Design a protein around this ligand. Structure first.
Ligand SMILES: CC(=O)N[C@H]1[C@H](O[C@@H]2[C@@H](O)[C@@H](O)O[C@H](CO)[C@@H]2O[C@H]2O[C@H](CO[C@@H]3O[C@@H](C)[C@H](O)[C@@H](O)[C@H]3O)[C@@H](O)[C@H](O)[C@H]2O)O[C@H](CO)[C@@H](O)[C@@H]1O
Ligand SMILES: CC(=O)N[C@H]1[C@H](O[C@@H]2[C@@H](O)[C@@H](O)O[C@H](CO)[C@@H]2O[C@H]2O[C@H](CO[C@@H]3O[C@@H](C)[C@H](O)[C@@H](O)[C@H]3O)[C@@H](O)[C@H](O)[C@H]2O)O[C@H](CO)[C@@H](O)[C@@H]1O
Ligand SMILES: CC(=O)N[C@H]1[C@H](O[C@@H]2[C@@H](O)[C@@H](O)O[C@H](CO)[C@@H]2O[C@H]2O[C@H](CO[C@@H]3O[C@@H](C)[C@H](O)[C@@H](O)[C@H]3O)[C@@H](O)[C@H](O)[C@H]2O)O[C@H](CO)[C@@H](O)[C@@H]1O
Ligand SMILES: CC(=O)N[C@@H]1[C@@H](O)[C@H](O)[C@@H](CO)O[C@H]1O
Ligand SMILES: CC(=O)N[C@@H]1[C@@H](O)[C@H](O)[C@@H](CO)O[C@H]1O
Ligand SMILES: CC(=O)N[C@@H]1[C@@H](O)[C@H](O)[C@@H](CO)O[C@H]1O
Ligand code: NA
Ligand code: NA
Ligand code: NA
Ligand code: NA
Ligand code: NA
Ligand code: NA
Lengths: 599, 599, 599
């Protein structure tokens, strides 16, 4: 009996109290401790050396206790540790061993899930220092790390980075680095109040698979001029992605340095998410330096059905090389997104764009291999004052990109800055079903809507269709004489162009190329012979040697004659057609024509 | 020892039985009560004044017990209360205090989540009365309410409204009113068997953020002629939305009064959901009267990837004004939806439409500021008998809407009823990539496919492309003389139009406008001069003064001559072109031409 | 007192230890056993006849214990049974009763959910045998089965099929057969390591509703030449679907026999998922033999926003008949998908296709009723060597399908094999906004890009637009003389076609049909009369009786004359137009023209 009371009050007491489920005589005859052992929480490890529970709080460092919990549950083949609601659990020191090379705080372990219902905060020990809060590598050298498998972080709780600024731009900070990560995920968690490099990284240089970030919130994760750069989620393993997340920043620095997602391996996605306050939406990039685990190609890349207010570029495409590996990007889709450039002064943030074809990290524009991209069914808007806004800023070599059935309402459609890079362009396709908005009408003095500042263009299609007038623009499309143009189709629909001085401009007369197919409106002065009856009209100018046919876009105010409805050319570069003189006489008219070459 | 047995059997007994997790000597030395205190259920509060548990059932009012649970868990900083599976928990009285002004039953509190695994039912005390089952306001006046934060309702359970009808049309009923709600959500729950105004409302007049409804079912939530109106989810805070839900109604009244979602603030979405039996899919509206918390603009509005069978309109756009605030709607995307009008008689429910540009609640059509809308990649079908079916019913002023790459298979493409409203239309863009289906071929006697019953149209594009014949229709597009038309492009592709009497009709001869760009087929009678050789042909009629060129759509059955291939006009309004008389003689022909103006 | 110690140590002991939540005097005075009874796990039933717990393992058959758990929890109105983490639970025998007719192992029951956190494995008793692991039918004859309602399987755990091959091709294997299933779902689970027919089936012949598969992984579920066929999820009830799943196969047999999803009833969807290694993406089919529970029509079918690498066809459409029922498929949308054919030899797997219009299970091509399909905003790629790759393989009767704003980069656009089936085609619409890629340029000797090997085509549109040259192809579009063509529009844009010998080919001269609307480029030899001045030019050939107009696509190298810009025809089939001889003389020229008929 003394024994008994003593046993009951001891830590083995629950192990002596019997239990059978719902008094079911067919159920297991268990002890209370067995049922309690089905679950586990931080309270089961958050104790002093004598076993007495310790209350969390800002003067208590919870790190060792949470690590002890993870270590133990790992030793039993896994389970889910609850981080209890109603408390804030502070972290106040660095971890040890394999995660120390990563500035790690907690080491994650395979099959050990964290159900974060309460709050995890960083103590001021971390102020001005690097850190990665949760780390799944088990070695300081990621190349020598084991894998992290089957690790899920989820719940209604919060990771709060304490508001601390970076101490130096060279520092790195992260929330969750899953490492070489297979079937890992973060769901439901709010990451907030920091100055960090990433909130979550998935994978390592292509090693990993099936990692996801779903229904998470990321709020105010950049706050200082020290922060070098930020991507809220960096996706560095295949078959992985981000869905239904919320990203918000409020700091000015974020408008210049921060991106919501980086998709950096094949079969990755970003969908259904909302972004506000960031410079950039998503990078879609194959870095050769990251090609170890899944190959040198980033393919099956999906950015779909997002909502964004950004200050720089929505999707940024890239690929690059190292001394021994070449990176390639292909088979991309960008669809269903509704994006705007937020209110800002012209040139006050990185050049506004829906798609950017960006140079590598060294600024090289001649290393890229980007092709088979489909941009369809998106909307883009930039306010009228934002000069630096484009459907595409095409700033590095491009091996193909297709635009179908978008609505682009910004300053430029196609842009690259002159005297910068001279990209080599192939297979740029701009379908006629792209709707060009009117917000920037009257703002385009001196500017070309499609400003083709490239080394060369081949196998490309630009079908310009206006939907309102903008007589301020210099031209709808312009090719400098430095840009070769071949095996291409360039058209300017005549609607809303009657009063334009210039429609398409070929400063090197490139439209004469053998395999160039063009059409655009022009005004032409003609003069007829004096004969009564069928009578020829000829252009006064001789710069139509390339024209295969032309037709009238003008009415004929005359009763006594009519100019030709249609024209062809002559060897001397004049247009010629047969009109009709009811009464004879030399006629002189100025007519608006659709000039056509091989179309 | 007596002490001991007594202590063990008392409510403090579990607090005396020790426990250590898995017999781990490094774990906390706890008591059983500590581990049990990690969770909480309704059973912990569902007791009489002596502490004896009460069984739920239809004669027991569970309200006070659930409120006591919520109140207590709130006092500890939050947690999750389980509503146990295997039981039905009846609610049978109104709450008290701040929620009484809202006819509230339960008051939600911040950080207190409800895991509803069992069923919550309404008792007949609520029959013929108003109610809001869960309310997150803390004050009868929402303007004086505190916020509700971090409150999630989730699980496999059910909210059942008892089937009771409304007592009066002026009454309001709701499931969950989150109030001024920040990071709140409903997930997994079935709402069923009612006559209610809303199932869920998010936010209050723009106050709130990050509220969501995900994987919920709403079944049979309207059942009587008393019910004034119904929106299953009303989204009245930004950065919030509905995803992957199921909405079904079976009552006839629902086909006339019910909508699945209302998106009423910026950065809101409705996606991936299935609707059956409703009048309407979604409202997308900025009410000036709701502009307090997030501004006067509804922007970044997304309706994507839904499946619907409805009886009225799929998406309804609106904006309005108050005495001192003006509401604006812009930057909308409607994409990927597959929608039909369900089987019904013509005119038996509100006018069928994929998009409706609706007048305000007073019927005013001259207050709206709706622009920058993209409608792309959707399908719409209405059965052939449904006269009242349109791609767009454009019934109020429109400042822009773009249609690209849709498939519309219904009676009308563009419609507004004559002698009703006379909307002022700008920037209506109907791209040629919109496919017009053939289900209503042969049903269109007396009707215009695009019936342009507007005050005016400017900066608009209508590119009509048929894909089968319908010789029953009066015209492909018709503008009454009352409609001004300027700075617009209107084309009718000739395919399937050879036998149409009328293609495009301009009852005020508006196609002559200086900045109108048109083309469409017409039949024209011509007569030539008698001269052998090149010889002119002239139209007998003189109503072609606006024509810039025309070309043959007809073969020439003759050997001895040919009419011109192409024509222009003369000051008197005749067409003229130069054909060829192999042998002389006056010729008279009737030819099908493509008439072109400035295109 | 002896009593007392004995009571405490007995299975009723926890039922004597009091508990009150957090020492709250307003809370229920309960016993520990009451709180423990709020949850249930397999441990509560996994015991020998004396009540002693049994450890799971490969020599222990857990089946009877899990069934006993499900049976008991069912008897209390439901709940959720946990399958504990950290253990592998082996199944080693067949179930009994109603599921034996289905080779069932476990019988699911209404309102009883399974939270699978650990692993469920099949023991080698099942090697070479049929099985269905979880079965929701309650009768061997599904027609006589009751329903399964409100049953959810979810968690981070795993179902492992043991790697065992099928014993015979006629055998069936499944993971979860929900049966006649209403509000059932599988979420989060990994199904792996098998040779099975299905992983999950939803519904039975249209009976069921609201069943879903979300965030599941299916890995390596086909492994042998014995396996007849495989669909990873078969959706056989309405208002149901698959979202955000991952499907991977590695076996060669899978490339020939396996499909990820089968959508077989109305209001069903497949979205946001990633597929690798399969033959097929999704079937979308109405089998008449499955029409009992939800009617004879499959409508509101959605395949959207998926990523796939497959070896055969992405979406396969079908409908068929039985002796007394006819199946119909309509109102389908296929949007936003990014798909490729994986690296393979030509003809090494089933014919590669984005859409296939497939014959019934007997090979009949004359039973189908498929219409109102929208295919928009997708990308498709096949490597250049894959001869057997098409945007659409149209192999059975088609009543309509619309393609808008896709990017197809493969060998064929439209294909059917000659001398096979002769489908009857109506309402095939290929919009000009479909972008035709260049990967297969130079590979197309002897081949037609659009190979119209049909019995007949009516009410169809083919608007061919190239975006690069491919002079290897025989023609852009070809109709054999056996194919009737009427009430259709067929155009070939001239861009990149100057050097093509053949553009459009009508081997039966079908383009002359009264209601055929065509245009395409051709080279034509002309000769003029000798007259100075306006002078006629006539084609030497007489096969242009069908031409309504033609215009020049060639420049005029001459100074002394010009050919006509535009032409019409004469009764003898010559073209004729009026050019200009500055000086007289008979002229002879060869010109590239755009030939037009009724356009
Ligand atoms: C090529 C490369 O190292 N890739 C890293 C990736 O690095 C990014 C880089 O691609 C670019 O976007 O600039 C940012 C700026 O922050 C990153 O570079 C910075 O970080 C890397 C990686 O840090 C090292 O490796 C981590 C795995 C360790 O945890 C960390 O302690 C550190 O040793 C560094 O090498 C650069 O010098 C530094 O400028 O980042 C992703 C995501 O973390 C990673 O998966 C990839 O390997
Ligand atoms: C302008 C406005 O009041 N907005 C309310 C919104 O009201 C809708 C209204 O926009 C329109 O759609 O008609 C319906 C018909 O039911 C609603 O009007 C009805 O309800 C409102 C709101 O009810 C008041 O305010 C609630 C917050 C309280 O809980 C309730 O007790 C009541 O005091 C009412 O003022 C109208 O007179 C009545 O006709 O409804 C949404 C969603 O509830 C709300 O967020 C918004 O403020
Ligand atoms: C018409 C039909 O039976 N439909 C079944 C469906 O059957 C598919 C069939 O549509 C086609 O796709 O071939 C596969 C090849 O595996 C299936 O046929 C095979 O299975 C069926 C169904 O199996 C019977 O019915 C199940 C409900 C029982 O559980 C099972 O024990 C068996 O009695 C069979 O009749 C065929 O002979 C066999 O070749 O399969 C789906 C999904 O299971 C089902 O819902 C539908 O009724
Ligand atoms: C912090 C971070 O990840 N920065 C990345 C790096 C990467 O190389 C770059 C261009 O691809 O995208 C930046 O945003
Ligand atoms: C019950 C309900 O919410 N009714 C709303 C109101 C709103 O003003 C209207 C038009 O915007 O949409 C109705 O359906
Ligand atoms: C195993 C399985 O489900 N096979 C199905 C059957 C169905 O009849 C067929 C054609 O519709 O699709 C197959 O893949
Ligand atoms: Na490091
Ligand atoms: Na150059
Ligand atoms: Na009120
Ligand atoms: Na008017
Ligand atoms: Na069977
Ligand atoms: Na035939």
């Amino acid at each position: 009996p003394d024994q008994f009371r003593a046993i009951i009050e001891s830590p083995e007491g629950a192990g002596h109290v019997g239990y059978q489920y719902r008094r079911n005589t067919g159920s297991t005859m268990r002890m209370v401790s067995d049922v309690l052992d089905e679950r586990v929480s931080l309270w089961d490890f958050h104790c002093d050396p004598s076993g007495n529970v310790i209350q969390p709080g800002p003067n208590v460092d919870s790190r060792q206790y949470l690590q002890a919990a993870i270590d133990y549950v790992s030793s039993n083949g896994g389970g889910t540790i609850t981080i209890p609601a109603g408390y804030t659990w502070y972290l106040g020191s660095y971890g040890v061993g394999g995660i120390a090379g990563h500035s790690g705080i907690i080491q994650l372990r395979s099959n050990v899930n964290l159900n974060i219902e309460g709050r995890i905060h960083l103590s001021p020990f971390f102020d001005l220092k690097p850190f990665q809060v949760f780390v799944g590598f088990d070695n300081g050298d990621p190349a020598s790390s084991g894998n992290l498998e089957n690790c899920h972080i989820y719940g209604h709780g919060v990771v709060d980075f304490g508001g601390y600024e970076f101490g130096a731009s060279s520092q790195l900070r992260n929330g969750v680095a899953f490492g070489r990560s297979y079937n890992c995920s973060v769901t439901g968690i709010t990451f907030q109040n920091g100055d960090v490099t990433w909130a979550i990284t998935l994978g390592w240089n292509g090693y990993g698979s099936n990692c996801y970030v779903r229904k998470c919130r990321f709020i105010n994760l950049v706050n200082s001029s020290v922060n070098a750069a930020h991507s809220t989620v960096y996706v560095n393993c295949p078959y992985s992605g981000v869905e239904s997340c919320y990203f918000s920043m409020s700091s000015s620095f974020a408008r210049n340095i921060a991106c919501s997602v980086a998709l950096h391996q094949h079969d990755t996605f970003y969908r259904g998410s909302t972004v506000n306050g960031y410079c950039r939406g998503a990078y879609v990039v194959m870095h050769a330096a990251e090609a170890a685990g899944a190959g040198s190609y980033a393919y099956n890349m999906q950015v779909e059905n997002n909502i964004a207010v950004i200050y720089g570029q929505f999707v940024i495409l890239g690929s690059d090389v190292t001394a021994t590996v070449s990176g390639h990007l292909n088979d991309v889709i960008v669809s269903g997104n509704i994006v705007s450039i937020g209110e800002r002064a012209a040139f006050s943030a990185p050049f506004g764009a829906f798609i950017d074809i960006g140079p590598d990290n060294s600024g090289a524009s001649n290393v890229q291999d980007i092709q088979r991209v489909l941009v369809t069914g998106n909307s883009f808007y930039a306010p009228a004052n934002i000069t630096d806004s484009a459907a595409i800023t095409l700033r590095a070599n491009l091996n193909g990109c297709t635009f179908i059935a978008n609505n682009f309402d910004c300053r430029y459609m196609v842009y690259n800055a002159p005297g910068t890079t001279s990209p080599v362009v192939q297979n740029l396709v701009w379908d006629k079903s792209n709707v060009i908005g009117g917000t920037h009408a009257n703002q385009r003095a001196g500017q070309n809507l499609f400003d083709m500042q490239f080394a060369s263009v081949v196998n490309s299609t630009i079908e310009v269709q206006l939907s309102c007038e903008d007589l301020s623009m210099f031209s709808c499309i312009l090719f400098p004489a430095s840009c070769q143009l071949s095996y291409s189709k360039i058209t300017v629909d005549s609607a809303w162009t009657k009063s334009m001085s210039n429609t398409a401009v070929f400063e090197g007369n490139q439209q004469a190329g053998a395999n160039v197919y063009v059409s655009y409106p022009a005004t032409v002065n003609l003069t007829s012979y004096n004969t009564q009856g069928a009578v020829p009209f000829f252009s006064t100018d001789t710069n139509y040697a390339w024209v295969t046919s032309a037709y009238s876009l003008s009415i004929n105010e005359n009763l006594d004659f009519s100019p030709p409805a249609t024209y062809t050319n002559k060897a001397n570069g004049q247009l010629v057609g047969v009109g009709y003189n009811e009464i004879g006489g030399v006629r002189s008219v100025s007519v608006r024509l659709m000039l056509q070459r091989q179309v």
